[PDB]
Amino acid sequence: LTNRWHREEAAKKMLDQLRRRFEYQKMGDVLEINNAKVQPKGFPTLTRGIKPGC
Amino acid sequence: YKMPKNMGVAPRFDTWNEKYEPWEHMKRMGRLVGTGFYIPPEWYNHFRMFPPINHNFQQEKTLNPHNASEPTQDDTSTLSPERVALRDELARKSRLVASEGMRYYNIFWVRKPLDTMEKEYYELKRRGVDHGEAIRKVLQGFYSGLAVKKRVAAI
Amino acid sequence: RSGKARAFVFRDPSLRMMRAGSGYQQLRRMGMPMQVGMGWR
Amino acid sequence: YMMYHRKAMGTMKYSKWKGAHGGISHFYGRTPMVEEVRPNEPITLVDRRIMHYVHHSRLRHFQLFRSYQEKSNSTECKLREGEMLRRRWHRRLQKSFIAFMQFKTMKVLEDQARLVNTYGQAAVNAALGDPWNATDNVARERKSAAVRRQVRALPMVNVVPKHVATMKQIHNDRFNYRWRV
Amino acid sequence: PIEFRFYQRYANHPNRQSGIQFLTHYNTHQRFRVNKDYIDYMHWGKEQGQARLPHRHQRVAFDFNDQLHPTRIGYAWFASQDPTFGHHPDLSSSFDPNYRVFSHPEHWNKMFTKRRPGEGDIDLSVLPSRSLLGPLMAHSDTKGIPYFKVDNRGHSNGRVPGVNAPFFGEFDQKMMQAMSRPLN
Amino acid sequence: RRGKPRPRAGMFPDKYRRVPMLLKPQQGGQQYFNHFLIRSTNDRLTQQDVDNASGQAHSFISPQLPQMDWRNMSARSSEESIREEMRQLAENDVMQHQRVFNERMWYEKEEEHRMKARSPRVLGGDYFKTRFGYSLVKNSEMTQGPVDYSQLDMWGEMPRYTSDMVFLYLVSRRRNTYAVAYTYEGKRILNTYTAGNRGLKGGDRGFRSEGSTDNGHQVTSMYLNDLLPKLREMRASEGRPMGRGEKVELVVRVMGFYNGRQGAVRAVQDRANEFHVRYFEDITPFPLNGPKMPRGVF
Amino acid sequence: PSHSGSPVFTQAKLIGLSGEEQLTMCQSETMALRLCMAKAGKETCERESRALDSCLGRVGHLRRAMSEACWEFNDWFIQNVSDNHTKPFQHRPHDWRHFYAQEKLVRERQQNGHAYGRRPKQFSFGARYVKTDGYGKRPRLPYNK
Amino acid sequence: REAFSNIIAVDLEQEGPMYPVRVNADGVRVLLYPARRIVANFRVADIL
Amino acid sequence: PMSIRGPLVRPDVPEDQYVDSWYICTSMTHHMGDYRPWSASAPPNAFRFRP
Amino acid sequence: REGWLFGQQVQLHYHRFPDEQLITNLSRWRTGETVGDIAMQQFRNAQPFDIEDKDPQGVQRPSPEVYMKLNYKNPATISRFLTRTGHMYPADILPLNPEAVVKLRVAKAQAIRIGLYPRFGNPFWFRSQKFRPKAYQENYDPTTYSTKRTVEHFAYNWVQTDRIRRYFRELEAVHTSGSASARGSGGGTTAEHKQQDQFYSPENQPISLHRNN
Amino acid sequence: RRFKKVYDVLSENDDMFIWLCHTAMSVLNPGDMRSRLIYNHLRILAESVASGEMTQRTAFRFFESAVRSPAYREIAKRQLEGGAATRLAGISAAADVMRRMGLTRRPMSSYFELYQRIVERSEAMTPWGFPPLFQFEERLSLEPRLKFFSRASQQSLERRRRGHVMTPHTTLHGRRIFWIPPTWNRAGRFLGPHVTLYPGMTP
RNA sequence: CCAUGAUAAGGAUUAUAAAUUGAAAGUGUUAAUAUCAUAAUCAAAAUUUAUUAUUUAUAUUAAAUAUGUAUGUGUAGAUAAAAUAAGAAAUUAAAAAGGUAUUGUUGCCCACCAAUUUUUAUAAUAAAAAUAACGUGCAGUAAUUAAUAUAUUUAUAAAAAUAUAUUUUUUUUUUUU
RNA sequence: UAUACAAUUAUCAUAUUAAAUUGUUAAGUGCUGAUUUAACCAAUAAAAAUAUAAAUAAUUUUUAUUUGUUUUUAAACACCAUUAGGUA
Ligand SMILES: [Mg+2]
């Protein structure tokens, strides 16, 4: 009776609790695509509409 | 979908013998030697005088299971079914006649009692004695000979 | 299916030339086409 | 409703069972198996042998499969042809095993002949249990009694597999937890 | 796959597994297109290899080490030859060239029904009846056709030295004198 | 451990892997070995003395000479002796399928022997040819001469019914099992006892043990134990009262191939103290081709 | 081992070891022990236990012999009975398309060469008995309609 | 080493084919015919 | 197999000649490759190599 | 290239040549050990059993008289080739002739319609057992469909050989013990055995080496 | 590694033994090996196989298709009933060819291998029947232990070993012989293979 | 603040034997990106924070100053540890079976929504095609009640449900009981 | 811009020599009542069983015409409703 997305999330969490990268490295992982730690930066120049800090 | 694991490396079942056919090697080596700049090997130097047989086409190309391509590997008994039945009946009636010729290994340079029994049976058949009576008479003759041998042994 | 048919091997050049025994050029050389125009100047 | 339908023989206030029962009944002409139970033959064993027969004959499978749910003619033909092909392939596989077991039996017989050669025919018969010590008839009678009791062949029927009622019953003839297409 | 690349020599389409064999006696060289005899792939090929190949009694191509079609006779005529020579292996008393064989797809067809063990369209003309009803109904006080002598044609050929007449000369197993060209 | 099940003791290495094999177990008591060996020798000597007193511990050799058996040799050299030896040889030269002594073969031949202990012109080939029927008799494989009517009547295997037997229907379904009892005329003696009727349906072990042998056994046993006084009072009212502890003749009729069948038959056998079962029948409507059943998920 | 290009999932079932289709041996002694332990009696039937153990002492050696014979059979099967995942499977209906194509060809040729792989229309359960006059009761061929 | 294992040779008494030979190794149709001179693509001509 | 190669990870030489190395999980030898037999340390013809 | 029986790659055989036994036992032949041997003498030319169905299609049965008698009026012969529940055997199990199956189905339909045969089951299943072939466990059949009926005979023969070996080894042990006792404990046992082997050990009368006793 | 080297040096010549055994046994009717024609055929083919100039499959085909005698089948009808000839002459010729040709330094090794590879195979199912694909070298082959006439055909080496829960961590804690010694950089806590933390007492 | 790298914890199958029951896949401090930065114990000090074995009812505060709190039927839920000089003993590991993804499920892909625009057309037309980021979804991709074909039907959209026919659905042994 | 398919086997609409069509049987309590289902559920509920032997391969199918929507007792049953039924 549960919905598909909730079932998937619960199953993933249960597998995580109950239970590779170096063996197999894909192009995205090598070039830092999938990695959420790497994030692009913006141009240093300040905008005009943004609220002033502090 | 399901595919056999070794289907990719499966050998071609129709053309995996043409590579190893002796005639292909013979022709290629003949051309190579005839070019004049190749030292002939000993197998070529010998088999040029004795080329292989011509009519040994493999079953892959013949596609006929009842074809006896290889004379060496041919296995077809020369005995007719009537002869097979006759000798089987004689051996079943008497184990002495069957085993006497062979024993541990077939001695091919000595006379066979089963062959002599079959010859006498054929002689009786053409004389006019039918199957059962001829078999009984020839077996009784063999037993008379064996009795003579045993009497000599006892003496 | 959308592709056309392709021969397994070539067609023998001798047979291809031999089948041309009644081509239009051969007919013209034999003079079968009757002339009704002016032709060349 | 057919007699094999899911809602057949239902017990309800408004539901009255069709047909006459007792003596000459609705099943009087439709009873497939009738056995006269006799003393020293338990009815539990009679039922066990009947169930083993109808299971090993792959007949209860078809009965349940056609009765509980509706399956298209294409599906039934597909399943039956798959079963036939698998059975034929298994017979082909088992023929090789039978041949190799016959060869192993020949090897065992050859080893027995080796033992006969190295011990003597009479010694091998005695080891096989020849009644060479049966001075009186009672000595051989004891072994005759033993083999007479051993000859008695009890029913070789075994316990039938249980039926598993999976959710929504994708397959109704399912008797094992193994998943099937 | 080889079928995807080469299609002039291989057909992977179902219903066309019969092939393009020209060595049959049928009205067309397309075995999958002919409608005389239908291949039973599941049981055929016991002694003829593949299922699509023609039967042993319907072959028109012969190997070097394979026996040809035996002559039907329907020994008496070998008195002049070796007395111990038994029956000639190339002489058969019961040999039918167009002898239909039982095939499930054509004779025992079950695709219309649910393919249950109890049903299936069957014709009994393919195989001679084994029932004891046959001889009992066809039992007569008078003798049979060979005694009554109702046949006037006899053998199709006028005179056969092997069958009709006594056989003289020497036997020729391999076709040597029968396959030769006159120089005169 | 780290939120994981503890592995079984088999996975762990040997608990006593660091002790010598002679320690586990210790074989102490070496000093008694010589004493017990000497005691054994002494008592064996005493038993040997007893056996020698009973009989004789003497052996001797007979110095046989070869010239003495010339009478036997002359007797064997005779024509009659050779003839009988050759007759035996011919008799045993036939094909023999007995490799070694077989207990099965010996038992069969002895059984046949004990069963035995307990118990002009020859027709010609032309005659056989003209007798066409005799050829069929040769390979008839059909009963010849007098034939028992028990193999011809079509009701011999069929049950023999009486007006007194009570027919007990045991229906087993996928999720239910119930037993009912009717008389010969078809009157329903007691109300039907289903799994839902008795409460087993829809409880613990739901959807799995509803049709199990356990629930079927329980419902059938309860139905029988409730029916028995009802059957007694029904017969008493009908005017044919039950006898003093009479066995009630029961005809079991079971339908359904589910699990609620073995439990039912076991309950019947457990209540067979009074329910004397006379006939057993199983009934099942095998589908050939009928109306469309409700569609499955597939 | 892969017979006809399909690997053998289990070879223990062929032997019968640890399976339903086992071999019955010393059934008389087993029955005697079962009856003795079922009856109330006076003491545990260690004598029947000794008899059964003496009967089945060689069962371990027999099982070892059959296991080594099964290993030798597996070796021979790999040697020459199979193809090691080389040939196409022959255990499913869609691997025998040619046979069913021949069946369809026979039916099509029977029905004037018009309908290929077509089945007669479904009819009611009592179609031949409840349909009125003027309506076809017995189903016809897909070409006959 | 593979080329030396699969090396072949031809009879040069004729110095060219005397009949058209048409084959196909991997679907590529190849035709070799007698001609007055070596007329073919650069690579196949160098091979010849 | 150990039944052939013996349960040895080093040549059977007295531990006096072997030193436990540093930064490497193996034992090394101070006199590299020059292995004195057991009888070298013991007096000539010594019972159980005793002094 | 496969065989038709079970897809074999080679021809089934045990011995192909008339002299391979002599080649294998050449040393024994020279030493004269095989003057009266039996294993070589009888199994030199042994060949595998012809394990195949001579009539796989199914046109062998029933008998012609059974064809004649297979009518609607007699349910006894109909029940012979009909299951216990009244269904027809599949061709995989019981391959009847096509004439046999069409006769059986038409006769069953006629008998059911008239009332001579029940719609389910057979009233002659027990009486048709004699006509039905019986696969005796005691007598082995080379062409059995099942492999258990062959493995049981293989086990029987192996157990017989093991019985021979066990009987002879125990007889040897008994005779050796008797001879040692007759010669005497002191006289028979050697000095080494009396000094070292004459103690309790895992091989010589040990205590129970197992727990939970 | 020393035993591996010794095994390789001993078995370097096994291919010729395999081919000679196949020629001796598989060929049903090779004819009369004593005849100099057949002897020369066999000797030349064996020399070619030993030199490597011809592969075993083609050499076997040459041997079985070489010219022996006109009307060979008709002549064999007189002698062989079933077409199977005695193997004594074949084995004698196969030993004589290797005795004459300096194949191996020890003359008796050739004869012993030829005899043993036959007597060991004689007790196997279908002893002289070989599938065409696996009979000789091919793209798809068999395991060295499962080859037909291999020197390592029969073995019962240990193939099941018990493993404890700490095995994947203590794979290198036993008496392992290290191809590369563990260092502190790789293994944080490991004393070495020569240490024993629970020593006994010895006199 | 941010200002590249590097050691940890985490036991599930190479076993007795002359032997060890702790892993490489990474843990605050360590070696290239800068662009207001004085945050550092030398005593006597300020719980709100996941990752910690405390002493239970005969005798009780002396040396650097050193714990005043919670007696309540060994008592809910939830949860921790050990088969190694300790003491524990018969039911257990050991099958098959997949990419439309290549950026490889954090993936391709689907219509609708939204935005630009092209072609046929001049009729208040219709149809078709191109497009990297939006919105609604998750339809398909062994893909979460299988998929394919035709017919009907519903409609925010992929589609969904039925009737019939198929498997480019991954598969599990009955030769007359 | 002009400049050489195939014809030995090609999966979306090119069917054309083929034996069909029709059988008249089965099932009939009301009784003190919990059947089916993952769950809800609706109202008498049991049922329809017969085949083969026989119709030429052709020279104008150039030619009629034909391919699972086919209308009524039950069992199945798609839109829609939501306490839950309709509908091939
Ligand atoms: Mg989805």
Q: Rounded to whole angstroms, what are the CA distances from K190 to E105, I15, I27?
A: 73, 20, 12
Cα A4 to middle of ligand 1, angstroms: 10
Q: Give F-chain residues touching J178 at CB under 8 angstroms.
A: none
Place of tokens 């005397």: H18
In the structure, how far is the CA atom of residue A8 from the C1' atom of nucleotide L162, in angstroms? 30
CB atoms near residue B105 (< 10 Å): 20
- Pairing mode, if any, of strands G2-3 and F275-283? unpaired
Distance CA F258, CA J88 (A): 24
Amino acid sitting at position F5: P
Q: How close does chain G come to J152, measured CA to CA in Å?
A: 7
Q: How many CB pairs under 8 A join B and H?
A: 15
The angle, 0 to 180 degrees and rounded to 10, between the axes of the packed helices K14-25 and K88-100 is 150
> Cα–chain-centroid distance for residue D158?
7
- Pairing mode, if any, of strands G6-7 and H21-24? unpaired
Distance CA G128, CA G119 (A): 19
- Four-residue CA torsion sign, J26, J31, J33, J37: positive
Distance CA F124, CA F137 (A): 16
Tell me which residue of J152, J130, J132, J131 sits closest to J141, measured CA to CA: J152
Distance CA D88, CA D82 (A): 10
What's phi and psi for J49, nearest 5 deg?
-65, 145
Chain L: nucleotides under 7 Å from a protein CB? 7-26, 35, 79-90, 92, 95-99, 102-106, 138-139, 144-146, 162-177
Task: Please say whether the beta carbons of F148 and F157 come within 8 A.
Answer: no
What is the SS3 assignment for G129? helix
Alpha-helical regions (H) of chain G: 12-15, 27-38, 46-56, 59-80, 97-110, 127-130
Peptide bond between residue F25 and the one before it cis (omega within 30 degrees of 0): yes
The resolution, in angstroms to one decimal, equals 3.7
Q: What is the dihedral of CA J33, J35, J38, J41, to 10 degrees?
A: 120
Task: Please say whether the beta carbons of B66 and B75 come within 8 A.
Answer: no
B146 Ramachandran zone, left/alpha/beta (phi>0; psi -120 to 50): alpha
> Cα–chain-centroid distance for residue D81?
23
**Beta-carbon contacts of residue F97 (< 8 Å; ≥ 6 apart):** none
Name residue F171's beta-bridge partners: F178, F255
Amino acid sitting at position F139: N
The tally of CA atoms less than 13 A away on the side-chain side of residue G51 is 14
Tell me which residue of D130, J30, A37 sits closest to F110, measured CA to CA: D130
Q: How close does chain G come to K113, measured CA to CA in Å?
A: 22
Is residue K12 exposed (0-12), middle (13-18) or buried (19+ Cβ within 10 Å)? exposed
User: Can you spell out the DSSP letters for I4-33?
Assistant: HH-S-SS-S--GGGEEE-SSBSSEEESSTT
Tell me which residue of E167, I31, K33, B150 sits closest to F89, measured CA to CA: B150
Two tokens, residue B104 = 């541990």
Cα A28 to middle of ligand 1, angstroms: 25
**Beta-carbon contacts of residue F86 (< 8 Å; ≥ 6 apart):** B143, B146, B147, B150
Q: Do B32 and H11 touch (CB under 8 A)?
A: no
Distance CA K186, CA K183 (A): 5
Amino acid sitting at position J164: I
Task: Report the b/e string of B34-70 with b at 16+ CB within 10 A.
Answer: eeeeeeebebbebbeeeebbeebebeeebbbbebebb
Distance CA J12, CA B75 (A): 13
Two tokens, residue D141 = 């009678």
What is the SS3 assignment for E58? coil
What is the SS3 assignment for J88? strand
Q: What is the dihedral of CA K11, K16, K20, K21, to 10 degrees?
A: 30
Task: Please say whether the beta carbons of H42 and C27 come within 8 A.
Answer: no
**Beta-carbon contacts of residue F239 (< 8 Å; ≥ 6 apart):** none
CB atoms near residue G116 (< 10 Å): 14
**Beta-carbon contacts of residue F260 (< 8 Å; ≥ 6 apart):** F170, F171, F172, F173, F176, F177, F211, F212, F213, F215, F216
Q: Provide long-range contacts, Cβ within 8 A and 24+ apart, for J64-69.
A: J64/E130, J64/E131, J64/E132, J65/E132, J65/F136, J65/F140, J65/F141, J65/F142, J67/E130, J67/E131, J67/E132, J67/E133, J67/J99, J67/J100, J67/J103, J68/E131, J68/E132, J68/E133, J68/E136
Tell me which residue of J146, D83, E42 sits closest to G91, measured CA to CA: D83
Q: Give E-chain residues touching C9 at CB under 8 angstroms.
A: none
Is the CB atom of residue F202 positioned under 7 angstroms from any atom of strand M? yes
Two tokens, residue J161 = 């050989």
What's phi and psi for J129, nearest 5 deg?
-65, -35
Distance CA G30, CA G54 (A): 12
Tell me which residue of D113, B92, B78, K127 sits closest to J17, measured CA to CA: K127
Q: Give I-chain residues touching K192 at CB under 8 angstroms.
A: 20, 25-27
Is residue C36 exposed (0-12), middle (13-18) or buried (19+ Cβ within 10 Å)? exposed
Two tokens, residue D8 = 């057949």
Alpha-helical regions (H) of K80-170: 88-100, 107-121
**Beta-carbon contacts of residue C11 (< 8 Å; ≥ 6 apart):** H22
The tally of CA atoms less than 13 A away on the side-chain side of residue K105 is 3
**Beta-carbon contacts of residue B27 (< 8 Å; ≥ 6 apart):** none
Report the chain D residue with the minimal C-alpha distance to residue J147.
D98
Q: Give F-chain residues touching D125 at CB under 8 angstroms.
A: 100-101
What is the SS3 assignment for D87? helix
Beta strands in E74-123 (DSSP E): 91-92, 108-109, 121-122
What is the SS3 assignment for F13? coil
Q: Which of D85, D149, D158 sits opposite G92 (nearest CB)?
A: D85
**Beta-carbon contacts of residue D148 (< 8 Å; ≥ 6 apart):** F107
What is residue J197's DSSP assignment?
I
**Beta-carbon contacts of residue K123 (< 8 Å; ≥ 6 apart):** D107
Direct distance between the N- and C-terminal alpha carbons of chain B, in angstroms, rounded to an integer: 85
Distance CA D96, CA B38 (A): 51
Task: Please say whether the beta carbons of K31 and K69 come within 8 A.
Answer: yes
Q: Experimentally, how was this structure solved?
A: cryo-EM
What's phi and psi for F252, nearest 5 deg?
-85, 130
Task: Please say whether the beta carbons of D60 and D54 come within 8 A.
Answer: yes
Distance CA F220, CA F225 (A): 9
Task: Please say whether the beta carbons of F269 and F220 come within 8 A.
Answer: no
Is residue J152 exposed (0-12), middle (13-18) or buried (19+ Cβ within 10 Å)? middle
Two tokens, residue F105 = 């073969």
Two tokens, residue D36 = 């006269």
Distance CA G118, CA G104 (A): 8
What is residue F181's DSSP assignment?
E
Tell me which residue of B24, B134, B34, B40 sits closest to B90, measured CA to CA: B134
Is residue E179 exposed (0-12), middle (13-18) or buried (19+ Cβ within 10 Å)? exposed
Place of tokens 């032949």: J29
Distance CA J19, CA K92 (A): 14
Tell me which residue of J22, F170, K34 sits closest to D47, measured CA to CA: F170
Task: Please say whether the beta carbons of H48 and H17 come within 8 A.
Answer: no
**Beta-carbon contacts of residue F293 (< 8 Å; ≥ 6 apart):** D5, D6, D67, D68, D69, D70
Tell me which residue of F166, F275, F267 sits closest to F218, measured CA to CA: F267
Residue F166: enclosing H or E segment and its boundaries?
Answer: strand F166-172
Is the CB atom of residue G113 positioned under 7 angstroms from any atom of strand L? no
Helix, strand and coil content of chain G, in percent to the nearest 5, comes to 50, 5, 50
Q: Do E139 and F136 touch (CB under 8 A)?
A: no
Distance CA B6, CA G6 (A): 10
Task: Please say whether the beta carbons of E72 and E66 come within 8 A.
Answer: no
What is the SS3 assignment for E81? coil
Direct distance between the N- and C-terminal alpha carbons of chain I, in angstroms, rounded to an integer: 36
Q: Give G-chain residues touching D85 at CB under 8 angstroms.
A: 90-93, 95-96
Q: Rounded to whole angstroms, what are the CA distances from B85 to B79, B131, B136, B141, J176?
A: 10, 12, 16, 21, 54
Distance CA B131, CA F201 (A): 81
Distance CA G83, CA D154 (A): 43
Q: What is the dihedral of CA E147, E150, E152, E157, to 10 degrees?
A: -70
Task: Please say whether the beta carbons of J135 and J150 come within 8 A.
Answer: no
Chain M: nucleotides under 7 Å from a protein CB? 5-13, 15-39, 43-54, 66-78
- Pairing mode, if any, of strands E71-72 and E91-92? parallel
Distance CA K14, CA K29 (A): 25
Amino acid sitting at position K169: H
Residues after which a C–N gap over 2.5 Å breaks chain D: none
Tell me which residue of I20, I5, I12, I18 sits closest to I37, measured CA to CA: I12
Cα D168 to middle of ligand 1, angstroms: 21
Amino acid sitting at position B117: M
Chain B neighbours among J 26-65 (CB < 8 Å)? 29, 34, 37, 40-41, 44-45
B55 has a chain F CB within 8 A of its CB: no
Direct distance between the N- and C-terminal alpha carbons of chain E, in angstroms, rounded to an integer: 57
| Closest nucleotide to G7, Cα to C1' | L96
Task: Please say whether the beta carbons of F172 and F264 come within 8 A.
Answer: yes
Tell me which residue of I10, I1, I5 sits closest to K181, measured CA to CA: I10
Q: What is the CA radius of gyration of chain C?
A: 18
What is the SS3 assignment for B86? helix
What is residue F188's DSSP assignment?
B
What is the SS3 assignment for J182? helix
Residues after which a C–N gap over 2.5 Å breaks chain E: 74
Task: Please say whether the beta carbons of J105 and J72 come within 8 A.
Answer: no
Task: Please say whether the beta carbons of K130 and K57 come within 8 A.
Answer: no
- Four-residue CA torsion sign, B103, B107, B110, B111: positive
Tell me which residue of J92, J103, J176 sits closest to E124, measured CA to CA: J103
**Beta-carbon contacts of residue I13 (< 8 Å; ≥ 6 apart):** I35, I36, I37, I38
What is residue A54's DSSP assignment?
-
Task: Please say whether the beta carbons of K67 and B49 come within 8 A.
Answer: no
Cα D171 to middle of ligand 1, angstroms: 24
Residue D34: enclosing H or E segment and its boundaries?
Answer: strand D33-35
What is residue D41's DSSP assignment?
S
Task: Please say whether the beta carbons of F280 and D46 come within 8 A.
Answer: yes
> Cα–chain-centroid distance for residue F288?
35
Task: Please say whether the beta carbons of J52 and J87 come within 8 A.
Answer: no
Alpha-helical regions (H) of H1-48: 2-5, 42-47
Two tokens, residue E154 = 């006899």
Place of tokens 């499962």: K146
The angle, 0 to 180 degrees and rounded to 10, between the axes of the packed helices G46-56 and G27-38 is 160
Task: Please say whether the beta carbons of K146 and K153 come within 8 A.
Answer: yes
> Cα–chain-centroid distance for residue A21?
16
Task: Please say whether the beta carbons of J123 and G22 come within 8 A.
Answer: no
Task: Report the b/e string of J60-95 with b at 16+ CB within 10 A.
Answer: ebbbbbbbbbbebebbbbbbbbbbbbbbbbbbeebb
Name residue H32's beta-bridge partners: H21
Report the chain C residue with the minimal C-alpha distance to residue E6.
C8
Distance CA K181, CA I24 (A): 7
Amino acid sitting at position B147: A
Q: Do G65 and J158 touch (CB under 8 A)?
A: yes
Amino acid sitting at position J39: A
Alpha-helical regions (H) of A19-50: 27-30
What is the SS3 assignment for K86? coil
Task: Please say whether the beta carbons of B79 and B87 come within 8 A.
Answer: yes
Distance CA J117, CA E126 (A): 31
